[PDB]
Amino acid sequence: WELTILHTNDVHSRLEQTSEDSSKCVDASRCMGGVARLFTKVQQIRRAEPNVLLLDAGDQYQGTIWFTVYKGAEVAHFMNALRYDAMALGNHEFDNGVEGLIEPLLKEAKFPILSANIKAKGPLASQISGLYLPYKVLPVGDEVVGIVGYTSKETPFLSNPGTNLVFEDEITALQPEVDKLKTLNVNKIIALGHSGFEMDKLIAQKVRGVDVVVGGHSNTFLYTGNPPSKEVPAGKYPFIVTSDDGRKVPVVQAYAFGKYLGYLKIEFDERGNVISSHGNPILLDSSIPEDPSIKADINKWRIKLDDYSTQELGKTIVYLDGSSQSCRFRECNMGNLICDAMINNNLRVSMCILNGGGIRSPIDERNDGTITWENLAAVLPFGGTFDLVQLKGSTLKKAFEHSVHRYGQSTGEFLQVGGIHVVYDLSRKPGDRVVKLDVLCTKCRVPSYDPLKMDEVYKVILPNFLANGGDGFQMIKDELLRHDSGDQDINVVSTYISKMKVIYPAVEGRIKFS
Amino acid sequence: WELTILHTNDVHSRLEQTSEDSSKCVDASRCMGGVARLFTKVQQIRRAEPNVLLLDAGDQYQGTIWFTVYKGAEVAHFMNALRYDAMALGNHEFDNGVEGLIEPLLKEAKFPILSANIKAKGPLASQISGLYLPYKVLPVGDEVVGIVGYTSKETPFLSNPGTNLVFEDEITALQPEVDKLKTLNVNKIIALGHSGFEMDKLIAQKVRGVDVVVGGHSNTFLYTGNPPSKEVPAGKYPFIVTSDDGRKVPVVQAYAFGKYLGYLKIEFDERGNVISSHGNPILLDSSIPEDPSIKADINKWRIKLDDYSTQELGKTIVYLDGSSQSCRFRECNMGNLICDAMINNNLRHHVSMCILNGGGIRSPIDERNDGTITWENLAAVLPFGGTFDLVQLKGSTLKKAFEHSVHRYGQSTGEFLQVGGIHVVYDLSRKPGDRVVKLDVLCTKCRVPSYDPLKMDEVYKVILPNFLANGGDGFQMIKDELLRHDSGDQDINVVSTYISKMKVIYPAVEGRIKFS
Numbered sequence A: 001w002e003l004t005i006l007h008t009n010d011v012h013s014r015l016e017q018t019s020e021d022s023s024k025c026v027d028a029s030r031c032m033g034g035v036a037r038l039f040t041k042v043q044q045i046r047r048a049e050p051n052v053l054l055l056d057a058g059d060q061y062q063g064t065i066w067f068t069v070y071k072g073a074e075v076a077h078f079m080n081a082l083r084y085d086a087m088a089l090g091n092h093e094f095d096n097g098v099e100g101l102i103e104p105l106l107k108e109a110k111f112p113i114l115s116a117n118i119k120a121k122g123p124l125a126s127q128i129s130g131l132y133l134p135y136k137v138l139p140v141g142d143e144v145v146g147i148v149g150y151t152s153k154e155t156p157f158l159s160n161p162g163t164n165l166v167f168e169d170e171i172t173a174l175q176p177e178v179d180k181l182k183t184l185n186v187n188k189i190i191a192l193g194h195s196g197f198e199m200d201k202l203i204a205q206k207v208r209g210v211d212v213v214v215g216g217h218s219n220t221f222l223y224t225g226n227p228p229s230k231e232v233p234a235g236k237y238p239f240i241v242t243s244d245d246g247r248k249v250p251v252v253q254a255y256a257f258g259k260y261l262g263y264l265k266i267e268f269d270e271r272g273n274v275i276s277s278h279g280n281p282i283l284l285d286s287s288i289p290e291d292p293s294i295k296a297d298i299n300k301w302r303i304k305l306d307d308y309s310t311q312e313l314g315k316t317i318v319y320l321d322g323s324s325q326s327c328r329f330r331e332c333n334m335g336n337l338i339c340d341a342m343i344n345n346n347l348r349v350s351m352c353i354l355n356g357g358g359i360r361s362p363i364d365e366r367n368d369g370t371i372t373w374e375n376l377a378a379v380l381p382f383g384g385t386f387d388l389v390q391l392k393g394s395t396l397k398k399a400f401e402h403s404v405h406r407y408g409q410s411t412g413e414f415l416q417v418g419g420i421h422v423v424y425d426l427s428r429k430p431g432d433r434v435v436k437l438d439v440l441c442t443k444c445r446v447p448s449y450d451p452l453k454m455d456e457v458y459k460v461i462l463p464n465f466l467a468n469g470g471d472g473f474q475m476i477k478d479e480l481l482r483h484d485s486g487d488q489d490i491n492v493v494s495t496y497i498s499k500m501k502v503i504y505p506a507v508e509g510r511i512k513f514s
Numbered sequence B: 001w002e003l004t005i006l007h008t009n010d011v012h013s014r015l016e017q018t019s020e021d022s023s024k025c026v027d028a029s030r031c032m033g034g035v036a037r038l039f040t041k042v043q044q045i046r047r048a049e050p051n052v053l054l055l056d057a058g059d060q061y062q063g064t065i066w067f068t069v070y071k072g073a074e075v076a077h078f079m080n081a082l083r084y085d086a087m088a089l090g091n092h093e094f095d096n097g098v099e100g101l102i103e104p105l106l107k108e109a110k111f112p113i114l115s116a117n118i119k120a121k122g123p124l125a126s127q128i129s130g131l132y133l134p135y136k137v138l139p140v141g142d143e144v145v146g147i148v149g150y151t152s153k154e155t156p157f158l159s160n161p162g163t164n165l166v167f168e169d170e171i172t173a174l175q176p177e178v179d180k181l182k183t184l185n186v187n188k189i190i191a192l193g194h195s196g197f198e199m200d201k202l203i204a205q206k207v208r209g210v211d212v213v214v215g216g217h218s219n220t221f222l223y224t225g226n227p228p229s230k231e232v233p234a235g236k237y238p239f240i241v242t243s244d245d246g247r248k249v250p251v252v253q254a255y256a257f258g259k260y261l262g263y264l265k266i267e268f269d270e271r272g273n274v275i276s277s278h279g280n281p282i283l284l285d286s287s288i289p290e291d292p293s294i295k296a297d298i299n300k301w302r303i304k305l306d307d308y309s310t311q312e313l314g315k316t317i318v319y320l321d322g323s324s325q326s327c328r329f330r331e332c333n334m335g336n337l338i339c340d341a342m343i344n345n346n347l348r349h350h351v352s353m354c355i356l357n358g359g360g361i362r363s364p365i366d367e368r369n370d371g372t373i374t375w376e377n378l379a380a381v382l383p384f385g386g387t388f389d390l391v392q393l394k395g396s397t398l399k400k401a402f403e404h405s406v407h408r409y410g411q412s413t414g415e416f417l418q419v420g421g422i423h424v425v426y427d428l429s430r431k432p433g434d435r436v437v438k439l440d441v442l443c444t445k446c447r448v449p450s451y452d453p454l455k456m457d458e459v460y461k462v463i464l465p466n467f468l469a470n471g472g473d474g475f476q477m478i479k480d481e482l483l484r485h486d487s488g489d490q491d492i493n494v495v496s497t498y499i500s501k502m503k504v505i506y507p508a509v510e511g512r513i514k515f516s
């Protein structure tokens, strides 16, 4: 018995086709992704193959003005038009609180929404009953396939789920669900969820009964053979994990932003054991036509976003690299621009820290350098503030160690900086990787970089998200000596670009590796 | 027979009293120098000692809006009121060309103006004839004292003396003059000139018959004992040179900007040989009152200078270090500010690299006056009225410019480069012309700018002053090897427009220049 799995993850409000770097589509002839194109490819597979499932591994919420304006209503409408079979909750599904998940998405979706490790309590428990499920048993031809869902246990530190939801350990909560399916004679089981590639391999190894793992969160690109675009593979597609019960478990992910459609063909025996598997993500480029009916519908919804002011805030003569491949791994000029904008607005304090997890999109310079509100909203969508904090040298050293404590997994805590020169040695054990930390003096007439002192006190400008312990920055929230509310994030950056008129941020050696 | 030599050098238009860093006077209670205070000190010494000479070793011209507006007429007027006995020509006396030296200074000074190594040719020979002299024999009581002048051989690369003036080697030109003085029965000889401390010491050692050397140009601070202010001594006052003809020759200098009055008391024998010498520069601080007559006259002349729009151009929240002790020796934030203003103004109407000679940065700016920056504060930093131009350069040409930048490091010369979009590391222990150990530059043929090592065979677009594109400060490799040269915007206007745009400025020392 053969099953075809079609899968998307971390679409992040890319409803329309985009530029290859997943920023706004300008040169339409070379544009990729979007739901209109995705529908054409999905229909080509469904008409050719008998047993097909279309799955989403979370983070459809947040990314463009489509979500700023429609707040998830666009997600339910277009995922329904594409006839997704199941979706697992991501951390971004909680960005507008529980109320912002229930009303636009859970009540309007015509497909099951899954998460086995999220438990509701108090008054909310009765209100959210049946709105999301731990699993779904789906008929596929004359057979049945069990799909078990999971969501990152880190969601309370990344989003707004509130106090009436408990995030259990993924492996602990998934085992009673898989066991229940096996007692119900469901021999084919897919683990679909949003925790990242490292947790996906752990679920494949330790959750007895799981046949295939379909994940997201880490924007992992897997490929077998010569890759078709700029994404570099982290391993082969699928990635094979040998479980603790000696079975080969395929693990898959399909990058992010709807650029690719994941495609895996599984050969099962009569007892639901995986005999073999093969496939690859499919690049959704201009050679695949956008579906005419979906496009016409996308255009109708686009009218409300078209009333947004298309006025030029300013110009860039350089590419503004806000890609996660850069800003979560190294110094990126978008990070330097925002940290310099933060310092400049406040002086109208020489040090700045900014998590890569907060930088959500790059900005292209080829459209006569024009920067609009729409371009900026995709970079800074959370509506947070840039606040003043007083920190000890020891707290600052702890935040920089946390910045790289699990380097290489594409996590949000990596820090972009202003008025700070940091050197990291990744060969050293976690918590002892900062080899050099020089900061700009304040008690000096002429500013210059001096070694950080553990017993000294520093004034830093950072997002209110980090002062509140976001991205696991617990040492900031617990040890800060002062915290003053600042100006709105996007407004600080638009004001800076308007004053400067022409911007040119560079990678100047603020972050170095040994 | 006893003689007291009072001496100034590199006053650089500091007519009014200044802040101790020699920028604008704001907190008057702590202000120093100025001609009014100098007059009180000179008057105190003249009434105490019968045999006194007041000498200037050049570079009175250029430094503040006093020179922008009065163009040397303030120099002649106030040097006459102080009754200077003689002055040697400096490089800055040629900033407004030969016509700018002849009309307001040579024609109005009531004292001799000297230089034994400058020779006139062409039609100027007849025009300038006798306006400046190789020497002057001065009566001092019952005796006579010979004073021979000299000017830096480097002046054509630093100023505008023109094609009709020839600069000879100092030692070659001075010896025939000193020998002539001996035949004229002049047994006491002072060499007064503007070539720097290293040349002053060579003059003392090799020019037979010279008794004392009074110099300038290098802003050298000499002192015996504990110094009274922030200047660090380069040696004792006086510095003693053992001459080739077997004598002890004192060499003196008195820093710059009229902050100090050089004071040297000499004991001569009957044949004009130095028996002994002692003194020190006198710090002209608040303990010496300003002469009321000179002060009133200074206030009268300042009326026309206030007409300069006192409108706040912008604000600084940091000290703007444009001092020579910094910008001629290491990375200074005033240099970073100017190079950033040069790149920003050019990108307004892709050029990522900037070079700027420390010799072009003429004053710091203080942040304590509510951070206010005016046209007067700026005109003291950039007074030459030059432009910031676009040039195309080979990687080899740029590497050579950075080698020339540190080829004779430690003499406080102007060729040291301040940078923008460049990361340079020097190792001074190495031979000259092989001191540049690291040179990284910002890419231009990239979507994201980043630092990459310089390539000898590569071609770069640099913003620099027109002065450097024309071989100023000895940058012959720039003038001779550049591939393109476009005219730019006025230097001072580029910096003021940037400050007005930014509103609040805070330049830092970031590690653009490093030493190994």
Ligand SMILES: N#Cc1ccc(Cn2nccc2-c2cc(Cl)c3nnn(-c4ccc5cn[nH]c5c4)c3c2)cc1
Pocket (backbone or CB within 6 Å): A094, A095, A096, A156, A157, A158, A159, A160, A355, A357, A358, A359, A382, A383, A384, A385, A411, A412, A413, A463, A464, A465, A468, A469, A470, A471
């Ligand atoms: N503890 C805590 C905590 C404090 C504040 C918030 C505020 N908040 N409510 C919903 C979304 C946001 C929000 C706001 C701002 Cl300004 C953010 N910058 N980055 N970032 C982000 C989002 C996703 C990932 C993935 N990995 N890292 C991430 C970081 C942001 C989330 C949330 C939680």
Ligand SMILES: N#Cc1ccc(Cn2nccc2-c2cc(Cl)c3nnn(-c4ccc5cn[nH]c5c4)c3c2)cc1
Pocket (backbone or CB within 6 Å): B091, B094, B095, B096, B156, B157, B158, B159, B160, B357, B359, B360, B361, B384, B385, B386, B387, B413, B414, B415, B465, B466, B467, B470, B471, B472, B473
């Ligand atoms: N070769 C040649 C050459 C080319 C151009 C000029 C222009 N020029 N005419 C008079 C004064 C200036 C002038 C203009 C500008 Cl913008 C200058 N920046 N620095 N600097 C300077 C002056 C003094 C010292 C001492 N040491 N280094 C110096 C450098 C400047 C002089 C002069 C000569």
Ligand SMILES: [Ca+2]
Pocket (backbone or CB within 6 Å): A187, A188, A189, A209, A210, A211, A271, A272, A273, A274
């Ligand atoms: Ca199975």
Ligand SMILES: [Ca+2]
Pocket (backbone or CB within 6 Å): B187, B188, B189, B209, B210, B211, B271, B272, B273, B274
């Ligand atoms: Ca003698």
Ligand SMILES: [Zn+2]
Pocket (backbone or CB within 6 Å): A010, A059, A092, A217
């Ligand atoms: Zn995501």
Ligand SMILES: [Zn+2]
Pocket (backbone or CB within 6 Å): A059, A090, A091, A092, A194, A216, A217, A218
């Ligand atoms: Zn996620």
Ligand SMILES: [Zn+2]
Pocket (backbone or CB within 6 Å): B010, B059, B092, B217
């Ligand atoms: Zn001088």
Ligand SMILES: [Zn+2]
Pocket (backbone or CB within 6 Å): B059, B090, B091, B092, B194, B216, B217, B218
């Ligand atoms: Zn000079």
